[PDB]
Design a protein around this nucleic acid. Structure first.
Ligand SMILES: [K+]
Ligand SMILES: [K+]
Ligand SMILES: [K+]
Ligand SMILES: [K+]
Ligand SMILES: [K+]
Ligand SMILES: [K+]
Ligand SMILES: [K+]
Ligand SMILES: [K+]
Ligand SMILES: [K+]
Ligand SMILES: [K+]
Ligand SMILES: [K+]
Ligand SMILES: [K+]
Ligand SMILES: [K+]
Ligand SMILES: [K+]
Ligand SMILES: [K+]
Ligand SMILES: [K+]
Ligand SMILES: [K+]
Ligand SMILES: [K+]
Ligand SMILES: [K+]
Ligand SMILES: [K+]
Ligand SMILES: [K+]
Ligand SMILES: [K+]
Ligand SMILES: [K+]
Ligand SMILES: [K+]
Ligand SMILES: [K+]
Ligand SMILES: [K+]
Ligand SMILES: [K+]
Ligand SMILES: [K+]
Ligand SMILES: [K+]
Ligand SMILES: [K+]
Ligand SMILES: [K+]
Ligand SMILES: [K+]
Ligand SMILES: [K+]
Ligand SMILES: [Mg+2]
Ligand SMILES: [Mg+2]
Ligand SMILES: [Mg+2]
Ligand SMILES: [Mg+2]
Ligand SMILES: [Mg+2]
Ligand SMILES: [Mg+2]
Ligand SMILES: [Mg+2]
Ligand SMILES: [Mg+2]
Ligand SMILES: [Mg+2]
Ligand SMILES: [Mg+2]
Ligand SMILES: [Mg+2]
Ligand SMILES: [Mg+2]
Ligand SMILES: [Mg+2]
Ligand SMILES: [Mg+2]
Ligand SMILES: [Mg+2]
Ligand SMILES: [Mg+2]
Ligand SMILES: [Mg+2]
Ligand SMILES: [Mg+2]
Ligand SMILES: [Mg+2]
Ligand SMILES: [Mg+2]
Ligand SMILES: [Mg+2]
Ligand SMILES: [Mg+2]
Ligand SMILES: [Mg+2]
Ligand SMILES: [Mg+2]
Ligand SMILES: [Mg+2]
Ligand SMILES: [Mg+2]
Ligand SMILES: [Mg+2]
Ligand SMILES: [Mg+2]
Ligand SMILES: [Mg+2]
Ligand SMILES: [Mg+2]
Ligand SMILES: [Mg+2]
Ligand SMILES: [Mg+2]
Ligand SMILES: [Mg+2]
Ligand SMILES: [Mg+2]
Ligand SMILES: [Mg+2]
Ligand SMILES: [Mg+2]
Ligand SMILES: [Mg+2]
Ligand SMILES: [Mg+2]
Ligand SMILES: [Mg+2]
Ligand SMILES: [Mg+2]
Ligand SMILES: [Mg+2]
Ligand SMILES: [Mg+2]
Ligand SMILES: [Mg+2]
Ligand SMILES: [Mg+2]
Ligand SMILES: [Mg+2]
Ligand SMILES: [Mg+2]
Ligand SMILES: [Mg+2]
Ligand SMILES: [Mg+2]
Ligand SMILES: [Mg+2]
Ligand SMILES: [Mg+2]
Ligand SMILES: [Mg+2]
Ligand SMILES: [Mg+2]
Ligand SMILES: [Mg+2]
Ligand SMILES: [Mg+2]
Ligand SMILES: [Mg+2]
Ligand SMILES: [Mg+2]
Ligand SMILES: [Mg+2]
Ligand SMILES: [Mg+2]
Ligand SMILES: [Mg+2]
Ligand SMILES: [Mg+2]
Ligand SMILES: [Mg+2]
Ligand SMILES: [Mg+2]
Ligand SMILES: [Mg+2]
Ligand SMILES: [Mg+2]
Ligand SMILES: [Mg+2]
Ligand SMILES: [Mg+2]
Ligand SMILES: [Mg+2]
Ligand SMILES: [Mg+2]
Ligand SMILES: [Mg+2]
Ligand SMILES: [Mg+2]
Ligand SMILES: [Mg+2]
Ligand SMILES: [Mg+2]
Ligand SMILES: [Mg+2]
Ligand SMILES: [Mg+2]
Ligand SMILES: [Mg+2]
Ligand SMILES: [Mg+2]
Ligand SMILES: [Mg+2]
Ligand SMILES: [Mg+2]
Ligand SMILES: [Mg+2]
Ligand SMILES: [Mg+2]
Ligand SMILES: [Mg+2]
Ligand SMILES: [Mg+2]
Ligand SMILES: [Mg+2]
Ligand SMILES: [Mg+2]
Ligand SMILES: [Mg+2]
Ligand SMILES: [Mg+2]
Ligand SMILES: [Mg+2]
Ligand SMILES: [Mg+2]
Ligand SMILES: [Mg+2]
Ligand SMILES: [Mg+2]
Ligand SMILES: [Mg+2]
Ligand SMILES: [Mg+2]
Length: 251
RNA sequence: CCCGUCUUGAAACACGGACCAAGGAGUCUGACAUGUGUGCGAGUCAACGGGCGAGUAAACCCGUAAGGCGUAAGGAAGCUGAUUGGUGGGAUCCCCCUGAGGGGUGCACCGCCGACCGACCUUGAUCUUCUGAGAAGGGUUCGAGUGUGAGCAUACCUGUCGGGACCCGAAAGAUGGUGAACUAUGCCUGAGCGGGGCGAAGCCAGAGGAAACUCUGGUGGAGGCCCGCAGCGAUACUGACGUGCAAAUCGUUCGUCUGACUUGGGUAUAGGGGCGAAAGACUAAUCGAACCGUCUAGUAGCUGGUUCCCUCCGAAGUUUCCCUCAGGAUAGCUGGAGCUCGCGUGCGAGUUCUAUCGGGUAAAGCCAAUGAUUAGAGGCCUCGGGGCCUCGACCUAUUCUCAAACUUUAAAUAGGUAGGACGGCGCGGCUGCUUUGUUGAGCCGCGCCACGGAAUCAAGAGCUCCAAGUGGGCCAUUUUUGGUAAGCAGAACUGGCGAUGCGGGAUGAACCGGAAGCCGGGUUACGGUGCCAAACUGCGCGCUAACCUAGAUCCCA
RNA sequence: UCCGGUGCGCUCCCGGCGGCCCUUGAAAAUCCGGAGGACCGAAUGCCGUCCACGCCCGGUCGUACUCAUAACCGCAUCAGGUCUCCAAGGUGAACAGCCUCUGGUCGAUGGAACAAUGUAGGCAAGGGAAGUCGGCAAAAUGGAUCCGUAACUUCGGGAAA
RNA sequence: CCAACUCAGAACUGGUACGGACAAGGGGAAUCCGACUGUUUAAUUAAAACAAAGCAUUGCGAUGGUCCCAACGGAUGUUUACGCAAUGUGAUUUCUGCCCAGUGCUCUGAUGUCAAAGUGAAGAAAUUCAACCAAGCGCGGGUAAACGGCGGGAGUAACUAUGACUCUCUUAAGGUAGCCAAAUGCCUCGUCAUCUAAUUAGUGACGCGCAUGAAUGGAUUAACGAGAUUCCCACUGUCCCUGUCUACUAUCCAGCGAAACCACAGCCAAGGGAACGGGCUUGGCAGAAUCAGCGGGGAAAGAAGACCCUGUUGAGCUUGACUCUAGUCCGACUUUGUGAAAUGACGUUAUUUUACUUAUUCCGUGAAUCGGAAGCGGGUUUUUGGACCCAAGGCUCGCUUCGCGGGCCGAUCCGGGCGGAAGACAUUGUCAGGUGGGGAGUUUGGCUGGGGCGGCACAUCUGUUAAAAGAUAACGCAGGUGUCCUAAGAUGAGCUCAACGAGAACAGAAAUCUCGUGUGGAACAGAAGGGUAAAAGCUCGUUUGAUUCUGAUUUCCAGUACGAAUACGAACCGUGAAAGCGUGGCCUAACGAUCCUUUAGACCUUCGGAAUUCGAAGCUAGAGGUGUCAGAAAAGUUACCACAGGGAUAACUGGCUUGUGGCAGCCAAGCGUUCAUAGCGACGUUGCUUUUUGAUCCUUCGAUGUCGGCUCUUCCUAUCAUUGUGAAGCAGAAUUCACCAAGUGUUGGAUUGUUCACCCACCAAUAGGGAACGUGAGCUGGGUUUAGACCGUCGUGAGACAGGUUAGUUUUACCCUACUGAUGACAGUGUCGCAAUAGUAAUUCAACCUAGUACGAGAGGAACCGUUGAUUCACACAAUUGGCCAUCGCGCUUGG
């Protein structure tokens, strides 16, 4: 046999991300004294499109805390943000869509996005268009907070983690059908070299476990175990179940 | 009939070979072995080295407790370690005698039987340091032993084996390198793409309506939309070409043509890796694993080739074992080397004779067992069958026909043994075996006898060493299995071909004759004598008349 | 070496508007402008000056020619392959085809005959696929204007029916 | 006053010509497949294959999923579930049934099995034992849009037929909705309808469907297609049936000028022969040199057959093959320190939970207000798309003074942690166990009337083949063997069996008992053969010779081993009064080396510095096994394929044979109203043929191009028609049988790739065959038979299918010969002739007349002669008609 397609991606080469026209990483300010204790005011200058990213981005200008200069930032735009709007980041920032607050200051039931996992990591959760996290409860004793992630999982994060109030703008993107291979071509042209996909059963045995045979068929269970080595781990990896998700399974 | 070649079989419609020159294939080396030559000999070897020396890679000299091989073997080992020959044949010589003679001598070699050393077993008087010594006495056991050494060095042929290993030849495997100037895909930066057709949303005007909204005309120019130029691509003619213009082109005809579009340059991915809208595609005319060098003269039970002359001898396709069936080893067949003897008194023979022994095929047998099988006849006692009758069972004597796996009997052919000096007789002796018993058994000594104890032949007999080739067979008379049969397949005895020409069968590997140095003469074999074509249209009798191509010679058509 | 006209004309450049995207379509050198006003002259001679004019200076390497039916690659002076710029008149919807001007060129070894077979291009009485595996090949249709246009349909088409 | 070019209409006019050249859709009715656009095997496959939007499933919350990496690290990721990664299906519309037993995947963790380390015990110790003991496996649950699967028999309703219904075996579930002789149906050219004059085709139906079926997606579907298929209209040189025109070749010349190929060569018939000769045998024959063509032959060239087989050659691929491996999971030790508590074991000490931060790991930043304590406030910036830096001010020293330079406040103090998280876990290193076709290496017997499948003829016994010693083959024939037995072994004694006859309550064909006859007709473990009667059989008694130690011999055979057997010797025993017998089974089969392991035996030998005791190593004899049985450790596939070879061996022709196929004869039971033989020929029996198929394997594997059709010639006769005749159950007409006879002819079509077949139609007739199953350098390429692709069945899979389907490069002649024509030669030259010999050709039908005649009850119904035409064929020819034009002859006409 030869190295299968799934194995060739890890080496990089022609499978690296297409990032030539990207505007840069979108993240909160670096945690500093101003945000830990009070609040810092910023102004939205423009809402821009980032190739490969559905969610729009917002350029925000801040006054540097101790240097005579402007401080430029790039935030994942929340639904409702507009140019010329004042954005407040810090512990004492008011609860309004667009402001960035620590989870400690956000009451239960609030909708937040770009939630930090580690205090100061500048945002890792709920960053895609139309996605958000829901604050469940606070634990003053442990100093931790419970939030519901877009996938429906509940996670414990320290109360110092920051989050932007509101949901990510651009929601409803995936509802529209593409209708065309060309539209998919343009979508993935600015993401990475992952499209089109050739089915394993259409290949020869040399390059895929599903290949070969006088009929197109897998010939063995497509569910493969977790510990299968690379090149053997194709199909439904460590599937707890298969088939149509009916009843409580699709909850 | 063309050579070479594999082959049961080649002039072959089996392969190599257009022609000439030159080159072109059993070698070198290590080990061992038999044989032969040479030296010395219970020894032998100058081999590492030293002393020297043709001013010198030679030659010459040196082995003082060197070393190798030999001089002693047996045992796993601890250990022990050759008491030193008897006999039947036999070369040569000596004496007598002049016989296929009789005595003495008895080497080499062979047969037979003891003894000695050791492993194993067995045995133990008398001693001893308690485990040893050994008076005597052993064994269907075992040994590459002993019983007055034969080795060592060296030369060369041949043979086995390792190596490039007679020469040339794989598909592969490994190692280390080089390519993305083609092509595949991503990325960066540029460039390129007539004229037409359809007429989406939005917009204007008019008309209808209670409203909702509806209708008509225009405007507008949407789209992996249509026709189509360039570009890109490549469907058909299965057209041309097919030693081409071209290792993919040419002609006409075709697909697509604002997009998943086309294209330049830059840049990234490298060989079990890349890349792949996926054809195992593509990765520089190379891809179901590229290219280059090396390992490498890779290995081949397989194909091809393998170089002068005469002379002599001269095969095998069979046995056993083998992951053995295209191979190998083994035995047989063969050559070379001899050696031991012998000269007709031969002790030999693919032959017979005499005497004697075994056999179960051919035939025969069923009126003999076992099995198969036809018909009547008598008795009809007793059993069943049916209607006293009656058929069949039964019993007796007969009768037709049979057998590779039936048989009383039983050939032909073939098989075994014997026909003297290794015989016989007489008198003695030995024994632990044997017997009631010097009774037997075998052996030993002495003496005597033994015209060779059927025929024929005997270009003689015996013994050993080393080694080649071969281990595909085929044909025929006869016996014979499978098969309808076969120029089919498989066995038995012999011959033949293969390896072999020559005369005859027109022609033919096998049929008939017959086997061969180079010639002259003579005569034949098989076959022939009208011509072809050497020899009669010879001398005799009969048969045949074919208007079907009358008929015309084993195998044989 | 002069005086005018004309345009859904062609090539290039620019302007402005609109359509399209789950596609929004580089960077840096360099240059310009701005906010701020530390510091600085003169009592009028100094200071400042991106103004005008005058004066001086200008490295290294490439530069011929072909760019292709003969200068590149394909073993060749090979009907193949190889990026791009300029683009006249007529016919016509048209950088279609056909003809012409500028420029280029007659470079493909020549001569004589006019058999078969061939290759390429044609035509054909009457019949009209009977040919053949099969309408292969060829023929027929073709532009434009007007009229007219079915089944079916995802209502968009089908349709140049 | 100046304007450009679009549209509409009218008159006139030409031989109805006018998009006049150029340019430039054929159209329609349907089936199959794929939605579409797109992409694909550069140089044989453009497609139904790939992709696609849509749909569905799976993993993953960063201490992560997937992947790369020798290591360090890295890709996804400038990312964060509307995301990334891994799969299947394949627009829309309608749907997507049942099965979790099997194979996977997965969840769970009082519970068997389960490694190293560690722990305990015993021992002089090496070591041994026990306990404890991770993951995994096992056990239990889930999961089919995971791999996949989804059934038989019999009865049964007012004619039959059918089976709602009932009975019964049974599965994890028994194929549901649909669909179908389908690109899926063997039978099959299925049945019915439709299309045609005729249809193996097409379409629509029917369905117990060899072997349909639901995201291995089922059923549909507008639009689209250089995709497969059928029909209709138009159109035509595709054809009937060829003809002709132009150009360039060929041809001839000047100049220039190769190559393939070549044993020698080149006329035939038959024969024999390696079974298909240019050479040989016997014949026919045979006359210099040369030109243009031609494809019969040279089993022509091109290439050490790619098919098939063999080899102790490979390679790609697969997996339930053997042996391994990266990775990954898991445990121990290490990194690795500081505490506490609970519990447990013996001041130490295990286990569990938890605390500490400095090791270690991670996150953030241009390391920019961290920790503590004070002041202050109570119980520092948020209507606005501006601006924000380098300190004002106060206090206080120096001062080379009203100007410079410092200090402290403004701007709290203190703290030797840049900020945060996890934390002795994780991580790293080492070993241990599990998993591991992701990956590596390798294997995948032999015999064989080719190989495979089957079988075992591979070790092995009896009878026979086997030809009266021995030996003797086949995938010959009929059978047997891998065991069984403390007796079924040994020995002694007594007894006699099978069967039959005649007798005895129940009792009979057959229970038990009595007498008689009884050569074995019984029994003796098993196959068969042989052998045995006071026994080798049967019943009893005593017993272990089924024992120990060698050697020898036989069978096999190389005169090796093994197995088996036999005769002795030396011991110890059994049995019998004793002789004697007994070393397994009455005899002929019933079995196994080296190495290794294990056991038994010998107050045995060695552990090499000397000893002792363990342990180990030897000597002798057995046991654990190799059945491919003289004894490797071993699964597939290749249609992507490779190499060495093989005509030692298959797939053609030819050759032998002729069972089978085809054709023919003899006898005469019977049929034929009567009547064996006009015409037939049962039961038997004798042949021929090589146009059937088999059998064989002789020729060819350094290659003889492998179906059919087309085209073209020749040959055969076993005669379909035509000429001449005989026979009849021959009145006529028609028909049948037979004779001479191969001169002439034997056709046009639908369906099928076909050969074959079948139908329609015509005809005098629509006979049968050969020539390497004639004929591919003659064509064609539909089929078969490479590589792409689809279905069904089969297989875990790679893949397989004398199953279906669709797309798939057909090369070379100029050599010799043959044949066709062309010059020349043939003794000066020319004209006119003769002539051997060879070739050869004509053919069939119809009408009229005979004649409504002969004949016949009637129906019906001929023929010769003669006349006039026609068919097939042949050889010529162009007056006429028709065809061809570059007469480039004349005219017309488009664009320039
Ligand atoms: K690989
Ligand atoms: K891609
Ligand atoms: K796909
Ligand atoms: K498969
Ligand atoms: K040969
Ligand atoms: K041969
Ligand atoms: K030859
Ligand atoms: K010396
Ligand atoms: K010993
Ligand atoms: K050698
Ligand atoms: K490679
Ligand atoms: K071999
Ligand atoms: K007899
Ligand atoms: K008898
Ligand atoms: K041999
Ligand atoms: K220049
Ligand atoms: K060129
Ligand atoms: K037709
Ligand atoms: K397109
Ligand atoms: K699936
Ligand atoms: K299941
Ligand atoms: K299951
Ligand atoms: K197509
Ligand atoms: K010339
Ligand atoms: K391969
Ligand atoms: K740790
Ligand atoms: K594996
Ligand atoms: K007895
Ligand atoms: K064997
Ligand atoms: K026959
Ligand atoms: K062949
Ligand atoms: K030919
Ligand atoms: K095609
Ligand atoms: Mg997809
Ligand atoms: Mg494929
Ligand atoms: Mg695989
Ligand atoms: Mg042969
Ligand atoms: Mg020869
Ligand atoms: Mg021949
Ligand atoms: Mg050969
Ligand atoms: Mg040759
Ligand atoms: Mg020479
Ligand atoms: Mg010495
Ligand atoms: Mg001793
Ligand atoms: Mg060599
Ligand atoms: Mg290998
Ligand atoms: Mg490139
Ligand atoms: Mg388009
Ligand atoms: Mg188009
Ligand atoms: Mg269209
Ligand atoms: Mg062609
Ligand atoms: Mg084609
Ligand atoms: Mg030319
Ligand atoms: Mg790599
Ligand atoms: Mg591509
Ligand atoms: Mg393939
Ligand atoms: Mg190389
Ligand atoms: Mg063996
Ligand atoms: Mg050979
Ligand atoms: Mg016999
Ligand atoms: Mg007999
Ligand atoms: Mg007889
Ligand atoms: Mg041989
Ligand atoms: Mg021979
Ligand atoms: Mg003859
Ligand atoms: Mg005469
Ligand atoms: Mg140019
Ligand atoms: Mg115009
Ligand atoms: Mg033009
Ligand atoms: Mg015509
Ligand atoms: Mg006409
Ligand atoms: Mg017509
Ligand atoms: Mg056509
Ligand atoms: Mg239509
Ligand atoms: Mg398509
Ligand atoms: Mg392509
Ligand atoms: Mg191709
Ligand atoms: Mg093609
Ligand atoms: Mg769908
Ligand atoms: Mg690492
Ligand atoms: Mg579909
Ligand atoms: Mg389902
Ligand atoms: Mg279960
Ligand atoms: Mg343990
Ligand atoms: Mg466990
Ligand atoms: Mg059904
Ligand atoms: Mg069906
Ligand atoms: Mg039909
Ligand atoms: Mg038809
Ligand atoms: Mg369907
Ligand atoms: Mg449709
Ligand atoms: Mg297309
Ligand atoms: Mg001839
Ligand atoms: Mg010849
Ligand atoms: Mg020829
Ligand atoms: Mg020719
Ligand atoms: Mg070959
Ligand atoms: Mg070959
Ligand atoms: Mg081999
Ligand atoms: Mg072999
Ligand atoms: Mg291999
Ligand atoms: Mg493997
Ligand atoms: Mg075999
Ligand atoms: Mg066979
Ligand atoms: Mg005999
Ligand atoms: Mg015998
Ligand atoms: Mg007995
Ligand atoms: Mg015995
Ligand atoms: Mg006694
Ligand atoms: Mg026995
Ligand atoms: Mg044994
Ligand atoms: Mg020692
Ligand atoms: Mg054997
Ligand atoms: Mg043969
Ligand atoms: Mg030929
Ligand atoms: Mg005749
Ligand atoms: Mg009559
Ligand atoms: Mg005839
Ligand atoms: Mg047809
Ligand atoms: Mg024939
Ligand atoms: Mg033929
Ligand atoms: Mg031919
Ligand atoms: Mg051909
Ligand atoms: Mg043919
Ligand atoms: Mg074909």
């Amino acid at each position: 046999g030869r190295v299968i397609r799934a194995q060739r991606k890890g080496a990089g080469s022609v499978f690296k991300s297409h990032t030539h026209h990207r505007k840069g990483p979108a993240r909160f300010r670096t945690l500093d004294f101003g945000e830990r204790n009070g609040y810092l005011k910023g102004v939205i200058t423009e809402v821009i499109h980032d190739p490969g990213r559905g969610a729009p981005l917002a350029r925000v200008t801040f006054r540097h805390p101790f240097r005579y200069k402007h401080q430029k930032e790039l935030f994942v735009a929340a639904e409702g943000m507009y140019t010329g709007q004042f954005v407040y980041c810090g512990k004492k920032a008011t609860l309004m869509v667009g402001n960035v607050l620590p989870l400690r200051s956000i009451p239960e039931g609030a909708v937040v996005c770009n939630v930090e996992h580690k205090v100061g990591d500048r945002g890792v959760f709920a960053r895609c268009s139309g996605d958000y996290a829901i604050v469940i409860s606070h634990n003053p004793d442990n100093g931790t907070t419970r939030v519901k992630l877009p996938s429906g999982a509940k996670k414990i994060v320290p109360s110092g983690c920051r989050a932007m109030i509101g949901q990510v703008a651009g929601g409803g993107r995936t509802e529209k059908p593409m209708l065309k291979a060309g539209n998919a071509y343009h979508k993935y042209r600015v993401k990475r070299n992952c499209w089109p996909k050739v089915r394993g059963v259409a290949m020869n045995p040399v390059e895929h476990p599903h290949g070969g045979g006088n009929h197109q068929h897998i010939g063995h269970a497509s569910t493969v175990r977790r510990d299968a080595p690379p090149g053997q781990k194709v199909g439904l990896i460590a599937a707890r179940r298969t088939g149509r998700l009916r009843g409580q399974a699709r909850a």
